[PDB]
Paper text:
Human NAD-dependent isocitrate dehydrogenase or IDH3 (HsIDH3) catalyzes the decarboxylation of isocitrate into α-ketoglutarate in the tricarboxylic acid cycle. It consists of three types of subunits (α, β, and γ) and exists and functions as the (αβαγ)2 heterooctamer. HsIDH3 is regulated allosterically and/or competitively by numerous metabolites including CIT, ADP, ATP, and NADH. In this work, we report the crystal structures of the αβ and αγ heterodimers and the (αβαγ)2 heterooctamer containing an α-Q139A mutation in the clasp domain, which renders all the heterodimers and the heterooctamer constitutively active in the absence of activators.
Crystals of the apo αMγ belong to space group C2, and the asymmetry unit contains one αMγ heterodimer, which forms an (αMγ)2 heterotetramer with a crystallographic 2-fold axis-related heterodimer. However, in the αMγ structure, the γ large domain exhibits an approximate 8° outward rotation from the α-γ interface compared to that in the αMγCIT structure, resulting in an “open” conformation of the allosteric site. Crystal packing analyses show that in the αMγ structure, the γ large domain is involved in close contacts (<4 Å) with the α large domain of a symmetry-related heterodimer and thus its conformation appears to be constrained by the crystal packing; whereas, in the αMγCIT, αMgγ, and αMgγMg+CIT structures (which all adopt the same space group), the γ large domain is not involved in crystal packing and thus its conformation is not constrained. Nevertheless, we cannot exclude the possibility that the conformational flexibility of the γ large domain may play a role in the proper function and catalytic reaction of the αγ heterodimer and the holoenzyme. In the apo αMγ structure, the β3G-α3G and β5G-β6G loops at the allosteric site are partially disordered, whereas in the αMγCIT structure, the β3G-α3G and β5G-β6G loops are well defined in the electron density map. A detailed structural analysis shows that in the αMγ and αMγCIT structures, the hydrogen-bonding networks at the αγ-αγ interface are different from that in the αMgγ structure but similar to that in the αMgγMg+CIT structure. Specifically, the α-Q139A mutation makes Ala139A1 unable to form hydrogen bonds with His131A1 and Ala139A2, and similarly, Ala139A2 cannot form hydrogen bonds with His131A2 and Ala139A1. As a result, the sidechain of His131A1 points toward the α-γ interface and forms a hydrogen bond with the sidechain of His140G2, and the sidechain of His140G1 forms hydrogen bonds with Glu148G1 and Glu148G2; and similarly, the sidechain of His131A2 and His140G2 makes equivalent hydrogen bonds. The His131A-His140G interactions render the β5-β6 loops to adopt active conformations, which lead the sidechains of Tyr126A and Tyr135G to adopt the active conformations as well. In this study, we found that the αMγ heterodimer is constitutively active regardless of the absence and presence of activators.
Residue numbers in the entry:
A (entry chain A): 4 to 45, 51 to 74, 81 to 338
B (entry chain B): 15 to 51, 59 to 80, 90 to 130, 137 to 354
Amino acid sequence: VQTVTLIPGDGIGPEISAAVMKIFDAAKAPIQWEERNVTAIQWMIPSEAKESMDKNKMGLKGPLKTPSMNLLLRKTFDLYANVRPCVSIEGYKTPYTDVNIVTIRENTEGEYSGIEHVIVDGVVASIKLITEGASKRIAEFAFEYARNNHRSNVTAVHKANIMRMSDGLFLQKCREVAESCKDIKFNEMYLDTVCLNMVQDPSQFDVLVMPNLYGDILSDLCAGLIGGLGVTPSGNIGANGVAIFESVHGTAPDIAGKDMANPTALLLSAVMMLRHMGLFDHAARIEAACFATIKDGKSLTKDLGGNAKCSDFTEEICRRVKDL
Amino acid sequence: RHTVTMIPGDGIGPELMLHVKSVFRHACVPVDFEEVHEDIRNAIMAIRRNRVALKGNIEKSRNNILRTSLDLYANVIHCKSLPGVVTRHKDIDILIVRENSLEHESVAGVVESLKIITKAKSLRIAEYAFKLAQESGRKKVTAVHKANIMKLGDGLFLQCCREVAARYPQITFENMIVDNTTMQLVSRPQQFDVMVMPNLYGNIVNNVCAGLVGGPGLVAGANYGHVYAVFETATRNTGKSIANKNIANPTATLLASCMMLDHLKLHSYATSIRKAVLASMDNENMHTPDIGGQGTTSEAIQDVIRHIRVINGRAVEA
């Protein structure tokens, strides 16, 4: 039995968090949940949340309200890798049906400094940061992710023809790491070509590694291909073995307490969490049960969009996962 | 009779310009092309004689020296669905406007890059997008930005779009974070009309849209200054592998030459040619390899000419 820090979050967070905890129970997942609130105080995160996470190493986070509370978590646990698997969902048709992509985004540097200067009146310079160490670290992560998740191919996304020094450096570290892992097939592609190919045939991509700003945009483009943030899982991997898995959809205040919310994103984030800690057999069962439920379509919640309550959708997943 | 500079360019550039001339000659378009190719500064002097150029693609950088010397500050691409090319999305019609590097190593291993936003250029591009939206009867301009993360710089750009929007109260003004934009583009791209954005996002958004309507071979662009305009294809690839093989897609070049015609106020010719290329593109046998067909550019041009009705020296409605 493994303890996982659970941050319900705001709005529908408690509701969809309940659904995931129920489903994990039905699946007999060896997981027990340490619920923590993280609303920022003083600027810091509560003692009681910070201790659990340092000890438990695994965290599951619902949606938060809007210094950002996500920003504090990133600084606090040094969450340097943002990971987003994007897979088309049978039964939730979008015009892109063979998407199976993992975006991996350097999450500490780039223009998220907030560093910006008025040079003279009417002229602003924003400052983007790239470092050798972070680029090496995110590339090592993308190759390790490839190996542990049976991915064949890592593509580095860059504009190293335009930004020779900053993207060239990021590219140079990916290549250096690729020489040590010929296990995985490595190639590199210009941002603009990636965007084109993303809409023309996303089925060609496997694992995409990229600096912070590109990843922020392409990870949302990929989520758009498969149906939006409501069905996208997401992980943040940090230092000291901590990893926080999260909903990236909004809190949805309009529907907060009405048994209407869609727990798929969080659930698949939890499935992502199981895989990160080696519990593949449970991840497989829980994921199958959820996909089988969406494919059936009888119990879809309103945004997926059936005529069903979170409860019924959650109950169906529990039903199906008890049969293995 | 207008005189228009023609830059053949590299790769597929020259063979497409011959096809453009052929179509124009058949359409009896009153335009004469003067071809143009330090020598390049002398080439620019020649280009500067005429206020309009049509150019194929090329390649401190020639294409950027071009836009400097002609002071072409606005890049515009026109992403429009062609009904005969069926993609995943239909009825898209988008004008993407954007303004046409500073790095150092602080300490070993640490690189810093500077992105410049200026009030003066933001206002100029925003005015361009709003004038454009008005001139062409478009109802909406959407500013695309990342002001949530880059508060001063994209904030300044957004603020300049707001000042200009205030002088065009009859145009809806929308502003949208670049991430949400790319999400909206691959799910409901019909909501968009005129988009204006700083340079970096235009790379992403241009190629998303081009892909949404079927590929860059279908998409015309232009660069505009206060006096000069240069008309080109949206993407700058020269097609060097696919050159002299009678395989390049003529659509974007023909459509660029139509938006050059409208700029010269030769509307009846532009409409006639443009409807001819759209009607030709209803026949899948005229599609070239890059959009998934098996046709040759020769067959496609021949079909475009067959769809241009010319009566007494002038192009007419079919």
